[PDB]
Amino acid sequence: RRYIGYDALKKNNVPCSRRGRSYYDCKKRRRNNPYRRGCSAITHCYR
Amino acid sequence: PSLKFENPSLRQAYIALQSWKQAIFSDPFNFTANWNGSDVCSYNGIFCAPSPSSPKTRVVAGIDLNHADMAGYLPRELGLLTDLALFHLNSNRFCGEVPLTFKHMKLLFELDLSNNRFVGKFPNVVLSLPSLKFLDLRYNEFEGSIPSKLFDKELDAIFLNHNRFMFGIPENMGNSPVSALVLADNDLGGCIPGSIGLMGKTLNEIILSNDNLTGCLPPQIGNLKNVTVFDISFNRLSGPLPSSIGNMKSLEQLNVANNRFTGVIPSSICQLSNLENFTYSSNFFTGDAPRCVADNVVVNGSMNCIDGKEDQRSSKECSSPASRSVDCSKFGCNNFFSPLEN
Numbered sequence: 001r002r003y004i005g006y007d008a009l010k011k012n013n014v015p016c017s018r019r020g021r022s023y024y025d026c027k028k029r030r031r032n033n034p035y036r037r038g039c040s041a042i043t044h045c046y047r
Numbered sequence: 048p049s050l051k052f053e054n055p056s057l058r059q060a061y062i063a064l065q066s067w068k069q070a071i072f073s074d075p076f077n078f079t080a081n082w083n084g085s086d087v088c089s090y091n092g093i094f095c096a097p098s099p100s101s102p103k104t105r106v107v108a109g110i111d112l113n114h115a116d117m118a119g120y121l122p123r124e125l126g127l128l129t130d131l132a133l134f135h136l137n138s139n140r141f142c143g144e145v146p147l148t149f150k151h152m153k154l155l156f157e158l159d160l161s162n163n164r165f166v167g168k169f170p171n172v173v174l175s176l177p178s179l180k181f182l183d184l185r186y187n188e189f190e191g192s193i194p195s196k197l198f199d200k201e202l203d204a205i206f207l208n209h210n211r212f213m214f215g216i217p218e219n220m221g222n223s224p225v226s227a228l229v230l231a232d233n234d235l236g237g238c239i240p241g242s243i244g245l246m247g248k249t250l251n252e253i254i255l256s257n258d259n260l261t262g263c264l265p266p267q268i269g270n271l272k273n274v275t276v277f278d279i280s281f282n283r284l285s286g287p288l289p290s291s292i293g294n295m296k297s298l299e300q301l302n303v304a305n306n307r308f309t310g311v312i313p314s315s316i317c318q319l320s321n322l323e324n325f326t327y328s329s330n331f332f333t334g335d336a337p338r339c340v341a342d343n344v345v346v347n348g349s350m351n352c353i354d355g356k357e358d359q360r361s362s363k364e365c366s367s368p369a370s371r372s373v374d375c376s377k378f379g380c381n382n383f384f385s386p387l388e389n
């Protein structure tokens with residue numbers, strides 16, 4: 001029900017609402033190391 | 048000065064950030080207020096992480112200033128942030144051109160420069176970025192044509208909508224393994240490049256709406272079996288919908304509105320079980336879609352020359368020079384390489 005393509009049409013919304021977190025890695029923050037990503041396709045791991 | 052630094056990387060980062068603090072002219076949400084002292088990691092919007100080259104040395108891994116209404120430009124000194132992996136700059140007021148010095152950001156993975164005041168030609172600097180997989184340049188004022196090398200590069204997502212781009216989509220679009228591609232709200236002339244058929248294994252969402260696209264919809268879109276969103280609205284596309292649309296089994300959002308499509312709605316649209324929202328409105332269709340599975344699936348069939356439905360296009364406005372079927376080869380693009388279904 002939420003798609004990155006249609007969200008891209010809105011200028012304000014971001015994929016990852018957590019500040020400093022990688023878009024690919026919106027999870028509950030413990031350490032926030034962007035170097036460990038674990039995802040390669042936003043459409044499969046969006047928000 | 049008298050400031051001691053933990054490692055040489057944060058010292059250059061302090062050089063880069065204070066230089067870029069001088070480049071910032073307006074900070075509504077007082078982000079640069081914290082940019083004092085030698086503890087670079089405490090700066091608002093600056094995010095440190097253990098370096099992969101040496102985990103003991105902490106380095107500046109990310110910069111995230113999303114939704115800050117900050118105004119300024121990107122100075123040359125930002126290229127010293129070689130350890131950067133993410134760079135978030137949505138909803139800022141940074142103007143000018145992307146600096147050539149980003150070539151040193153070898154580890155940069157995702158780049159979001161959306162909703163800004165960047166101008167000039169398309170920044171070819173992002174093409175040199177080795178680790179880049181996420182490129183976001185939406186809502187800016189980048190000029191010129193989209194370079195063909197962009198679609199040769201291995202990227203995950205490319206967003207270029209509502210920018211000052213021109214001169215059509217590069218014909219090598221099919222070479223990009225992108226899962227999400229949005230090139231909408233642009234004055235791009237030409238047809239849908241037929242290279243989309245090559246994108247079947249990787250593409251998941253594509254939106255080409257509100258572009259200046261004229262021509263026929265290529266039938267090799269059926270190879271796009273794992274694409275969820277397919278939006279071609281607000282274009283000058285003429286022709287029939289190919290029966291191959293039913294092969295896009297994962298299609299959830301299908302928007303074909305605001306075009307010049309002739310003929311009937313094929314019966315293969317019946318095969319789409321994941322389809323939840325379908326829109327084929329303000330088109331010159333003469334045949335309606337069947338009853339197959341249409342509650343909880345919204346369909347809008349407005350402004351269509353079908354005799355059965357209600358709220359249809361005017362009789363005058365129908366049987367018009369666009370309502371007439373088109374040769375589909377009278378256009379100068381080569382979308383398709385095999386004759387149409389008929």
Ligand SMILES: *[C@@H]1O[C@H](CO)[C@@H](O[C@@H]2O[C@H](CO)[C@@H](O[C@@H]3O[C@H](CO)[C@@H](O)[C@H](O)[C@@H]3O)[C@H](O)[C@H]2NC(C)=O)[C@H](O)[C@H]1NC(C)=O
Binds near residue numbers: 075076077
């Ligand atoms: C970010 O920090 C700056 C200061 O570091 C804040 O600016 C301050 O904003 C308040 C607004 O309530 C100003 O108070 C006003 O002063 C004028 C006198 O010129 C008075 O007539 C108003 O009735 C009001 O009391 C304050 O002077 C100003 N300080 C400055 C400019 O040094 C700013 O508000 C901070 N950002 C946010 C989002 O709060």
Ligand SMILES: *[C@@H]1O[C@H](CO)[C@@H](O[C@@H]2O[C@H](CO)[C@@H](O[C@@H]3O[C@H](CO)[C@@H](O)[C@H](O)[C@@H]3O)[C@H](O)[C@H]2NC(C)=O)[C@H](O)[C@H]1NC(C)=O
Binds near residue numbers: 302325328
């Ligand atoms: C099913 O999908 C269709 C197509 O995407 C949805 O219709 C679209 O709805 C959006 C807003 O939700 C419309 O955007 C607006 O368009 C006006 C046009 O002037 C513009 O001024 C606004 O700023 C805004 O961008 C969009 O035009 C519209 N498209 C069509 C072809 O009607 C529909 O809402 C979806 N239905 C459900 C239940 O999700």
Ligand SMILES: *[C@@H]1O[C@H](CO)[C@@H](O)[C@H](O)[C@H]1NC(C)=O
Binds near residue numbers: 234235236237259
């Ligand atoms: C559409 O494209 C044609 C040629 O590409 C151009 O002359 C025209 O101004 C464009 N129209 C709109 C409304 O963008």
Ligand SMILES: *[C@@H]1O[C@H](CO)[C@@H](O)[C@H](O)[C@H]1NC(C)=O
Binds near residue numbers: 272273296297
């Ligand atoms: C692609 O579509 C098939 C159709 O059943 C589905 O099983 C699969 O999970 C989808 N995604 C991928 C990555 O194959």
Ligand SMILES: *[C@@H]1O[C@H](CO)[C@@H](O)[C@H](O)[C@H]1NC(C)=O
Binds near residue numbers: 328346347348349
């Ligand atoms: C189709 O979209 C138009 C857009 O204005 C709207 O007026 C109309 O009610 C819609 N039809 C249906 C059946 O939702």
